[PDB]
């Protein structure tokens, strides 16, 4: 989710600092495409602000923050809209006061008996903001972060999570056998290193990137050296190579990073050469 | 000049230097052949240590190939 | 066959829509219905691949004008943003009634509005036919549709003699000429996405002169910045026959232009037109139904079609066939409709980009086939959410300088 360093009203309640945000480290193009996009962190845009309320007894103009006294139990904040009031989470009430201050610093305190007469309404979305301060990780101690996709056989849903650590999530003993690739494509869409851990998959079928995808669009073979080769889905090609078996699923965002070799098909191999070139 | 001819009919140039000879073998003395005939065989790249030292992810495809008929 | 060439001096003059010669209606309009046992409370199976629930977060495409050059459109309470553009089949028409059941299906698949407790326009003033609670929703409910009636099967010439030209070929030349006029007219309306769902197949032997059509495509694509999207062509039509694919013995040309036998137009202009192939609801290509030419560029779903019913006020699944048989529609004419919706959503989020750039954004984010580039499907299967969010390079595809 996107956030701006000039919006002091939102940075402060969350627990962020303008300098801290400006000094954030880079992000690779590879990871930027993998993470799904969420709504922006901005001040809620309450509609028709400042006008009079439709319902009787409204404590103030539309958009004012209301609170109830602590002596009658835990305080519940709320917002007065045109046709009624809608509840607010604690962390969002703080943002509305700070942003909608315009010099005002506190809400109007109203008693339960007068509050109970106001009709309840729900007209604006507020589920984006967390309910408590952000536990921002100090990047110097955790310089590595990864996107993880997994699906168990027989399930209808894939699981998506984010991982952060001091180093790439590979076993300390195996750190020596990560493969370092050559890199002909300079567009920033090809990886630098590849690792084949336990229970890796050789024969794969491409699938959509969302966690609910169900298609199976094409077949590929991934070699130990890191390159990927395509297989034409025909009975003669499948059986000649010995791939009459069921392929494992893979997402396009992760697979597209390996270098692509020539296609494997019976028609392509029936050719003779005197000598090979070297461009 | 020194050349190596394969059973498939292709010829490859071999470097005169001790490194290239010692690595492939070829220590024995070569036989003589006339250039008007030897030039008729197709030529491949020369076997030089200095150019063998390369890495690739994928190789270039060969233009204008010929059909293998069963 | 050599790739097309263009001479911009051949533009047709502008003018009000009207046929080249007087015409009369020859057949009754097609009836429609529903297959036994369908339940419209479930989403159509083709909507799972598009993942619309995530794509609509950024918006529904408000303020975009899409032109539907086809067999026209019939108004319905679910299409509150329809505009009558013109008619080329009957001199007195305006393009707001489809006798063939083709036109309203394509349009409703793009812009039909979701269900509600009450409709915005309950009035029903629509005219009769001429004689001789619900899960369905369009891809972009916010767009504005322009209807232009370009072609129909129900009409014919009322002086059938045609002189020195065979009556079979005499009609093709009239279509090529009448197609260029509709593209020019639709551009002056300010449309930003032009959708073409009816095309001609021609033998490679003595192809018809298309100079007028070549300039018309260039004018709309460059000087007016419109995105032109066209169907790859259904193989059941009168003259379309299948084309050969890549040939490993001749790496000379990787798309195999030298082996072409059937030409599809306007799809032919691969420099300015986006051509869409078809795939089933699972992701396999419809190998037996779409023409695999060398110009194909992308693909999208084409089965389990659903849409608003003309001549009624509800949904439909099939059209009344020649016999008593109830026949179900399928093919590229509908896949081109899906991409027309995705193109509208993309150029609402990136309003600064020109047509040539929006096309590159759709091509580069598609899941590719085993050969990298193929003919039954172009660069791959369309992908909505990816097109709206990845960081695509602004330049076209380029090969690496050296691999070693």
Describe this structure in words.
This is part of a larger assembly, with 2 copies of chain A and 1 copy of chain C (404 residues). Chain A is α+β, with helices and mostly antiparallel strands. Chain A contains 8 helices and 13 strands. Chain A has helices at residues 8-14, 18-22, 29-34, 90-99, 112-115, 235-241, 252-255, 266-269, and strands spanning 65-67, 78-80, 85-87, 108-109, 144-150, 159-165, 179-180, 193-194, 203-207, 219-222, 228-230, 248-251, 271-272. Chain A has a 4-stranded mixed β-sheet with strand order 3-2-1-4, covered by helices on one side. A 4-stranded mixed β-sheet of chain A has the order 11-10-9-12. A two-stranded antiparallel sheet of chain A has the order 5-6. In chain A, helix 1 (8-14) runs antiparallel to helix 4. Chain C is of the alpha/beta class. Chain C has a 7-stranded parallel β-sheet with strand order 4-5-3-7-9-11-12, sandwiched between helices. Chain C has a 3-stranded antiparallel β-sheet with strand order 2-15-16, with no helix packed on it. Chain C has a two-stranded antiparallel sheet with strand order 1-6. In chain C, helix 3 (102-111) packs parallel to helix 6 and helix 4 (167-188) packs parallel to helix 5 (211-223). Chain C is globular. Chain C starts with 22 loop residues before the first strand and ends in a 15-residue tail after the last helix. Classes of the chains: A alpha+beta (279), C alpha/beta (404). Chains in contact: A-B, A-C, B-C. Chains A and C meet through helix 3 of A and helix 8 of C. Chain B: Part of the ESX-5 / type VII secretion system (T7SS), which is composed of cytosolic and membrane components. The ESX-5 membrane complex is composed of EccB5, EccC5, EccD5 and EccE5.
